[PDB]
Design an enzyme around this catalytic site. Structure first.
Site, PDB file in Angstrom:
ATOM      1  N   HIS A 116      76.475 -21.095 -25.276  1.00 26.99           N
ATOM      2  CA  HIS A 116      75.534 -20.253 -24.526  1.00 26.99           C
ATOM      3  C   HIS A 116      75.529 -18.998 -25.287  1.00 26.99           C
ATOM      4  O   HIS A 116      75.787 -17.906 -24.419  1.00 26.99           O
ATOM      5  CB  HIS A 116      75.935 -20.102 -22.825  1.00 26.99           C
ATOM      6  CG  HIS A 116      75.070 -19.735 -21.988  1.00 26.99           C
ATOM      7  ND1 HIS A 116      75.182 -18.375 -21.790  1.00 26.99           N
ATOM      8  CD2 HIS A 116      74.123 -20.223 -21.161  1.00 26.99           C
ATOM      9  CE1 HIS A 116      74.181 -18.199 -20.979  1.00 26.99           C
ATOM     10  NE2 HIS A 116      73.527 -19.255 -20.600  1.00 26.99           N
TER      11      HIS A 116
ATOM     12  N   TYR B 103      72.803 -31.142 -14.528  1.00 32.97           N
ATOM     13  CA  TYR B 103      73.996 -30.335 -14.108  1.00 32.97           C
ATOM     14  C   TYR B 103      75.158 -31.111 -13.951  1.00 32.97           C
ATOM     15  O   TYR B 103      76.227 -30.624 -14.471  1.00 32.97           O
ATOM     16  CB  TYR B 103      73.650 -29.487 -12.838  1.00 32.97           C
ATOM     17  CG  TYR B 103      72.767 -28.266 -13.282  1.00 32.97           C
ATOM     18  CD1 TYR B 103      71.608 -28.110 -14.021  1.00 32.97           C
ATOM     19  CD2 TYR B 103      73.361 -27.020 -12.992  1.00 32.97           C
ATOM     20  CE1 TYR B 103      71.089 -26.662 -14.288  1.00 32.97           C
ATOM     21  CE2 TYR B 103      72.712 -25.887 -13.476  1.00 32.97           C
ATOM     22  CZ  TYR B 103      71.748 -25.727 -14.023  1.00 32.97           C
ATOM     23  OH  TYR B 103      70.795 -24.419 -14.168  1.00 32.97           O
TER      24      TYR B 103
HETATM   25  N1  ATP Z   1      78.005 -26.497 -16.615  1.00 28.36           N
HETATM   26  C1  ATP Z   1      77.224 -26.347 -17.463  1.00 28.36           C
HETATM   27  N2  ATP Z   1      77.813 -26.212 -19.028  1.00 28.36           N
HETATM   28  C2  ATP Z   1      77.004 -26.046 -19.929  1.00 28.36           C
HETATM   29  N3  ATP Z   1      75.352 -25.753 -19.996  1.00 28.36           N
HETATM   30  C3  ATP Z   1      75.083 -25.767 -18.593  1.00 28.36           C
HETATM   31  C4  ATP Z   1      75.718 -25.985 -17.387  1.00 28.36           C
HETATM   32  N4  ATP Z   1      74.756 -25.859 -16.328  1.00 28.36           N
HETATM   33  C5  ATP Z   1      73.624 -25.571 -16.898  1.00 28.36           C
HETATM   34  N5  ATP Z   1      73.687 -25.310 -18.200  1.00 28.36           N
HETATM   35  C6  ATP Z   1      72.804 -25.256 -18.965  1.00 28.36           C
HETATM   36  O1  ATP Z   1      72.424 -23.799 -19.310  1.00 28.36           O
HETATM   37  C7  ATP Z   1      70.903 -23.553 -18.986  1.00 28.36           C
HETATM   38  C8  ATP Z   1      70.787 -22.361 -18.152  1.00 28.36           C
HETATM   39  O2  ATP Z   1      70.930 -21.103 -19.198  1.00 28.36           O
HETATM   40  P1  ATP Z   1      69.885 -20.090 -19.538  1.00 28.36           P
HETATM   41  O3  ATP Z   1      69.379 -19.573 -18.311  1.00 28.36           O
HETATM   42  O4  ATP Z   1      70.180 -19.445 -20.720  1.00 28.36           O
HETATM   43  O5  ATP Z   1      68.605 -21.334 -20.018  1.00 28.36           O
HETATM   44  P2  ATP Z   1      67.119 -21.055 -20.007  1.00 28.36           P
HETATM   45  O6  ATP Z   1      66.440 -21.537 -21.133  1.00 28.36           O
HETATM   46  O7  ATP Z   1      66.598 -19.898 -19.334  1.00 28.36           O
HETATM   47  O8  ATP Z   1      66.734 -22.333 -18.601  1.00 28.36           O
HETATM   48  P3  ATP Z   1      66.118 -23.638 -18.844  1.00 28.36           P
HETATM   49  O9  ATP Z   1      65.911 -23.967 -20.329  1.00 28.36           O
HETATM   50  O10 ATP Z   1      66.918 -24.566 -18.043  1.00 28.36           O
HETATM   51  O11 ATP Z   1      64.666 -23.351 -18.151  1.00 28.36           O
HETATM   52  C9  ATP Z   1      70.659 -24.840 -17.944  1.00 28.36           C
HETATM   53  O12 ATP Z   1      69.212 -25.259 -18.215  1.00 28.36           O
HETATM   54  C10 ATP Z   1      71.326 -25.931 -18.848  1.00 28.36           C
HETATM   55  O13 ATP Z   1      70.897 -26.391 -19.754  1.00 28.36           O
END
Ligand code: ATP
Ligand code: MG
EC number: 2.7.7.108
Length: 333
Positions: A261, A298
């Protein structure tokens, strides 16, 4: 046991300094003080395997895995189930492979396929943003991308998320898909710079420098992000990763990036684009995770965090079959 802990720590210090005779005495002493010391058993197993004593190494690994009677039942049962699960999983990949070959076989210059490819393009953009609360309808997204006039009574943030996805997808399709060579940190940043650029151009294309929390996941400390991103791209271009089934490789690449992340936002959108790049390079079409599958998505991600990624691979495999069934369904001729 405090002495068992101490004996293992010195056993490992003697192992680094190359004093294997002393390391063995301390490993044996650690197990004398605590026979059920999982750390010492597993670590003395690794030590035994280095000296090419496979039987002893296996004894210690198996002992560490079967401390209590309920562990013993779990091992004999898991040894029975694993082959059946391997068969069920392998079957599902071969079923996907057959449907990929049918989609690929269809002539690129086909009237039906072109319409479907054009319609499904907007479906992916819709689902990739809507899965995290983007309220834009499918007709609105097409209006924004086809005309490049803004829609009324919908935030500039929501519409700039769509523009960024379109920008990122174009970049991949034209530049990265057909590009022969290794995928680097720069390529991931180029995708992210387009994905998030139109919403947050300050943070778009660079790693976070702060601690965050994603759902029930604790991602790395900002000071360790860069090293883990270097280890990540090293794996992406490894021979091991090349051997993997494209769907497994694409799923693993996805999960690993959202685990790190590394960005302040746009981690999901970026990791799903990287997933589709890998699939497209392997000759599969781009797949979609629908907004209805959010809780499943999730649930398998939380399962992956606690040390079983197989459910997430199976989930991506399901999303792959659904995409292919949609392309193959459009034989309405
Ligand atoms: N337990 C978890 N472990 C790892 N990654 C996770 C977990 N839960 C959620 N995520 C990922 O993290 C994302 C959210 O992080 P972030 O807000 O940076 O992404 P985003 O690009 O803004 O959201 P999205 O692409 O889903 O619209 C989720 O959409 C999922 O892909
Ligand atoms: Mg977000």
């Amino acid at each position: 046991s405090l002495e068992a802990r101490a004996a293992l720590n010195q056993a490992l210090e003697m192992k680094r300094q190359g004093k294997r005779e002393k390391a063995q005495k301390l490993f044996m002493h650690a197990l004398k003080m605590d026979p059920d010391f999982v750390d010492a058993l597993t670590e003395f197993g690794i030590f035994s395997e280095e000296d090419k004593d496979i039987i002893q190494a296996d004894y210690l690994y198996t002992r560490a895995l079967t401390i209590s009677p309920y562990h013993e039942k779990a091992l004999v049962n898991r040894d029975r189930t694993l082959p059946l699960v391997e068969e069920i999983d392998q079957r599902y990949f071969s079923i996907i492979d057959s449907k990929v070959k049918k989609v690929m076989s269809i002539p690129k210059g086909n009237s039906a396929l072109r319409r479907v490819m054009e319609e499904t393009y907007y479906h992916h953009i819709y689902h990739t943003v809507a899965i995290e609360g983007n309220t834009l309808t499918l007709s609105e997204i097409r209006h924004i991308l086809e005309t490049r006039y803004a829609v009324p009574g919908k935030s500039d943030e929501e519409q700039n998320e769509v523009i960024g996805m379109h920008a990122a997808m174009k970049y991949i399709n034209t530049t990265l898909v057909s590009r022969i060579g290794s995928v680097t940190i720069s390529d991931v940043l180029e995708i992210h710079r387009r994905v998030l650029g139109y919403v947050d151009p300050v943070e778009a294309g660079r790693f976070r420098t702060t601690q965050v929390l994603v759902g029930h996941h604790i991602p790395p400390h900002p000071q360790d992000v860069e090293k883990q991103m270097q280890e990540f791209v090293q794996w992406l271009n490894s021979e091991e990763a090349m051997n993997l089934h494209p769907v497994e490789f694409a799923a693993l690449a996805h999960y690993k990036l959202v685990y790190i992340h590394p960005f302040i936002d746009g981690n999901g959108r970026t990791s799903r684009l990287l997933m589709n790049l890998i699939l497209m390079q392997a000759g599969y079409p781009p797949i979609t995770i629908r907004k209805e599958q959010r809780s499943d998505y999730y649930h398998v991600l939380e399962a992956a965090n606690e040390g079983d990624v197989r459910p997430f691979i199976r989930f991506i495999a399901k999303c792959t079959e659904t995409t292919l069934d949609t392309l193959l369904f459009a034989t309405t001729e």
